[PDB]
Amino acid sequence: MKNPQHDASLLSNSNEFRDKNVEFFASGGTRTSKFDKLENHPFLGYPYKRGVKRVIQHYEPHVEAGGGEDLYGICIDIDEFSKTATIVPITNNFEGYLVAKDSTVKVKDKLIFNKDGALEKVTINATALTDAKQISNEVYLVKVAVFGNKA
Amino acid sequence: LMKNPQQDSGLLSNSIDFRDQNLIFSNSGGVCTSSKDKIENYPAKGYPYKRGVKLSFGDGTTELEVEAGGGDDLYGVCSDIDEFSGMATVIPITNNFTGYLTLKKVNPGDKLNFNQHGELEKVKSVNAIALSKAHKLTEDLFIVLASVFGNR
């Protein structure tokens, strides 16, 4: 979901400072600017840390996990109670840990968002900064820099 | 698929009518209960609530459990569940039970049998007689008042 550490059975050992940030609860970006535009949109499904597209149908338009030519932005945080998602518009650049389709993504690889909002090797939307890292059975996170859409 | 509905209602209930108030899914136990009934409890494998159960054996490391089933493996009827401990309350087939049980998606007096999933179905090896028509709680969830009094 969002926080997988609220079902833990042991206390964490808070001594080491290395290799402690590549997790699924790490909301936001590794480097954040004060002048980054953040939007709140109602969402359907679970688009957290994924590319999001805007869907219009009566109710206001919502956002859901997607990519391709419908790519509207990237979801970086979610409020479950209000069922809202914080979105960085595709017109704004972003660096952070996003979901990848599999573990075949390597450094210096050009990445595209797919229908599920996951990054995959090859328009071009991002460039991988680290290797794909396994957090859960199917959860693969990769540090990546997004620079809009470029052919 | 839960005795206690997860989605809590947005309105208060109106306690003005005394009829047709027991036709809910959270009505655990039986309509007619004897003080000399034999009541067991077992670890639950899945959600066998309001269904006929059978004894399932694991590798051997863990103890036996109960899972929804019927046929010649029928051991008893699951009347209640404690979700915190995963404990299913069972009434053995050697004891007779009268209550609301899950029906497979039937008129008072029709003979019934337990299928592979612990659901009552219209007919061989179990004495189940329907005492009411099928009441639909959900588009796929149907209950029926049945009296079980052993095997045939």
């Binding site: - | 209602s9 947005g10 109106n14």
Partner: protein, 313 residues
């Protein structure tokens, strides 16, 4: 605080001129109670009992008896926090826009902070009243493009598990047909032991116009309004019946009791508009301010509201 912050002082000196919401007329003093919350939920528990079978006759010896079952329901009220932003003139720039009779730029629709805040608060209060009435939030007359809200957030018109009546398109002009539907809904109401309470009716202007026609050969001393009052008094144990007209409604009639034991409004104590401390400033004369408000908190029992709709086909 007033020495340092000027906008806070302006709000303090202009807050009195904001008119009270009209939704206060739709409720009684005991029917409204504030809750200390901004965004979240409040939960209550209600217990109920029921009969499982016919009672058992105690003859000779028997140990198999019919059972009485119990159940619990959890009622949850969701409160949501919303915000609006408005542009105004910076405090130090007012002298350069003061005119003979007014202050501000008519060419650019820029106002001083006090006037801008007053108008914005009035508009937000109108939106809040509309939400409390109809259960929806929208800015279009069609009512489309609504804002997706949380569950357990309802108004007097969209509250579920209530009595709903519909008057056909061909019978829209027929006040007798409308009154027939109203009587049917009134009979289907279930007040219970809380019947000796005043009742409230909310109607649209067209229905208010129709209500003053003579009762139908035509009568000579009694009218449709009097007939409706007598009909409602038949069920409220001859208690007060109040009639109100709201321009928000269109071809709809709402009937409900003013009893705190059946319908209660528990709004957040921060529901009405409140200024935000953050002010956006730049090198120009235009600044931006923010207003916060909270929505949610209407609790009603089942089958205690009559909602009559008149189809306009």
């Amino acid at each position: 605080l007033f020495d340092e912050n000027y906008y806070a002082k302006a709000v303090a000196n202009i807050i009195g001129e904001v008119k009270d919401p009209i939704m206060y007329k739709w409720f009684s003093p005991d029917q409204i109670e504030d809750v200390d919350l901004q965004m979240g939920y409040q939960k209550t528990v209600k217990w109920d009992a029921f009969l499982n079978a016919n009672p058992t006759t105690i003859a000779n010896e028997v140990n198999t008896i019919s059972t009485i079952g119990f159940s619990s329901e959890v009622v949850r009220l969701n409160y949501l926090k919303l915000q609006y932003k408005f542009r105004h003139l910076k405090q130090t720039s007012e002298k350069f826009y003061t005119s003979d009779s007014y202050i501000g730029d008519i060419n650019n629709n820029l106002l001083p902070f006090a006037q801008a805040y007053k108008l914005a608060s009035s508009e937000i209060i109108k939106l809040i009243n509309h939400f409390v009435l109809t259960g929806t939030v929208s800015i279009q007359k069609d009512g489309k493009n609504q804002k997706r809200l949380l569950p357990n957030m309802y108004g007097l018109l969209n509250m579920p598990e209530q009595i709903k009546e519909e008057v056909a398109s061909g019978d829209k002009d027929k006040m007798d047909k409308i009154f027939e539907k109203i009587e049917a809904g009134l009979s289907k109401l279930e007040l219970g032991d809380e019947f000796s309470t005043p009742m409230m009716v909310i109607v649209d202007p067209a229905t208010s116009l129709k209500l003053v026609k003579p009762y139908a050969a035509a009568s000579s001393c009694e009218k449709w309004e009097d007939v409706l009052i007598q009909t409602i008094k038949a069920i409220n144990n001859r208690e007060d019946v109040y009639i109100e007209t709201s321009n928000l409604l269109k071809h709809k009639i709402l009937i409900y009791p003013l009893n705190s034991e059946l319908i209660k409004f528990k709004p957040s104590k921060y529901m009405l508009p409140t200024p935000n401390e953050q002010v956006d400033k730049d090198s120009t004369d235009v600044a931006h301010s923010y207003i916060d408000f909270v929505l949610g908190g209407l609790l009603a029992t089942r089958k205690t509201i009559l909602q009559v709709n008149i189809k306009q086909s």
